[PDB]
Write an enzyme that holds these catalytic residues in place. Structure first.
Site, mmCIF file in Angstrom:
data_model
loop_
_atom_site.group_PDB
_atom_site.id
_atom_site.type_symbol
_atom_site.label_atom_id
_atom_site.label_comp_id
_atom_site.label_asym_id
_atom_site.label_seq_id
_atom_site.Cartn_x
_atom_site.Cartn_y
_atom_site.Cartn_z
ATOM 1 N N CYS A 1 0.817 -1.328 0.037
ATOM 2 C CA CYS A 1 0.019 0.107 0.052
ATOM 3 C C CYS A 1 0.723 1.360 0.058
ATOM 4 O O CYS A 1 0.544 2.149 -0.565
ATOM 5 C CB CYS A 1 -0.922 -0.084 1.183
ATOM 6 S SG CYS A 1 -2.443 -1.280 1.068
ATOM 7 N N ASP B 1 -20.239 11.931 -13.961
ATOM 8 C CA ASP B 1 -21.768 11.713 -13.745
ATOM 9 C C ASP B 1 -21.824 10.937 -12.658
ATOM 10 O O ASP B 1 -23.026 10.732 -12.015
ATOM 11 C CB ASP B 1 -22.117 10.956 -14.853
ATOM 12 C CG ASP B 1 -21.590 9.584 -15.445
ATOM 13 O OD1 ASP B 1 -20.549 9.349 -14.544
ATOM 14 O OD2 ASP B 1 -21.927 9.052 -16.180
#
Lengths: 218, 220
Positions: free
Chosen positions: A46, A134
């Site tokens: 990570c 959107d």
């Protein structure tokens, strides 16, 4: 993958980050958005992924794409972890990163986004979500925390998504930026002829159908 | 499904006969490629690439299988196109089966389609998940690319290699890792154990936090 399907509008959650409180839709605005999920802070893969994302931030920003990370730990840990990320990048070990990191130490967001089972580090919180302007889900990637993501692939897929949205074309397998593209199957022959003056090439198939249509990258 | 979820042991009709999912997988890894429909452009290119790459996965104990929302009859006709796309003799012979999900049951069961399985057509655009299962029938990785963004098979092979490396050598692969690059020791493994496990040497990159989690070791 996550609990959302392709086409699903993102949860307009409110959360606190390293940069402050945010409402998901507000943060995204009119930009594309990439949400990277991580199980915990101060973790190997990570750390390499966030350091790379930080270095690559400018490439995404110029494509109207906002980046945001989520990790199941507190903001103070997020801030401290940022000095490590900065140091890994051979940069001044500051607490400032080019994108926020959401505090989900309570695991409420991981549950909302469907990447955690309460009946069970939360190894499942690993989804990378891509939303368009959107607010809908466009792409999702679910690599385990032991398999580091490939950012050249994440960038490649973003260019592809944007190509479809603006040029109405689809990219074939292993497409590289600049290669021939494909006409959307819903585009009529009469229409594709005018829309793509560079030329539309239909590969002849045994079935006789005309769905394998290529056209130069517009 | 979430990572670690056990695959459903469904029975389905395919281009090569009926199969029971867990039986099909056996003691091999398995990748399930989902497609919204037959005779589609991007899906045809991906299936053609999977056919040429099948040998690379097979030698790695990875079985390939595809699912498409259409009849097995159509799957067979579509296979001739897929072969022709690869410039091979247009037979209905592919190196992997294509599951008939004309009924849409599997798509819903696998969670890649809202339970509206009755829609005449509409194009099952959400059914695009690639599932990678291990010998234990558990989900190890998944990719969800729309039908307008063709998959990258170099990336798929690369991730299968990491998955198997972690399963066998207890190591993790960092961002943008290429087969042969240094890997990382699992944060789980204590300092004492690691020195013994990885005799090639372990390098701890010192960080501002004093924590010793960024440990690297040559690919074993």
């Amino acid at each position: 993958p996550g609990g959302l399907l392709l086409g699903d509008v993102a949860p307009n959650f409110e959360a606190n980050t390293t940069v402050g409180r945010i409402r998901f839709h507000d943060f995204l605005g009119d930009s594309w958005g990439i949400l990277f999920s991580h199980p915990r802070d101060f973790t190997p893969v990570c750390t390499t992924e966030l350091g790379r994302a930080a270095k690559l931030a400018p490439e995404f920003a110029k494509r109207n794409v906002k980046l945001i990370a989520l990790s199941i730990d507190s903001v103070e840990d997020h801030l401290a972890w940022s000095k490590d990320i900065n140091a890994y990048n051979s940069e001044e070990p500051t607490e400032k990163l080019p994108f926020p990191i959401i505090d989900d130490r309570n695991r409420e967001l991981a549950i909302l986004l469907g990447m955690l089972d309460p009946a069970e580090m939360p190894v499942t919180a690993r989804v990378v979500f891509v939303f368009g302007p959107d607010k809908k889900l466009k792409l999702s990637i679910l690599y385990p925390a032991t398999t580091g993501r490939n950012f050249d692939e994440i960038l490649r897929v973003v260019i592809s998504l944007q190509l479809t949205a603006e040029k109405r074309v689809a990219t074939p397998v292993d497409w590289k930026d600049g290669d021939s593209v494909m006409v959307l199957p819903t585009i009529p022959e009469e229409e594709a002829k005018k829309l793509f003056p560079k030329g539309v090439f239909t590969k002849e198939l045994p079935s006789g159908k005309k769905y394998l249509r290529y056209t130069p990258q517009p």
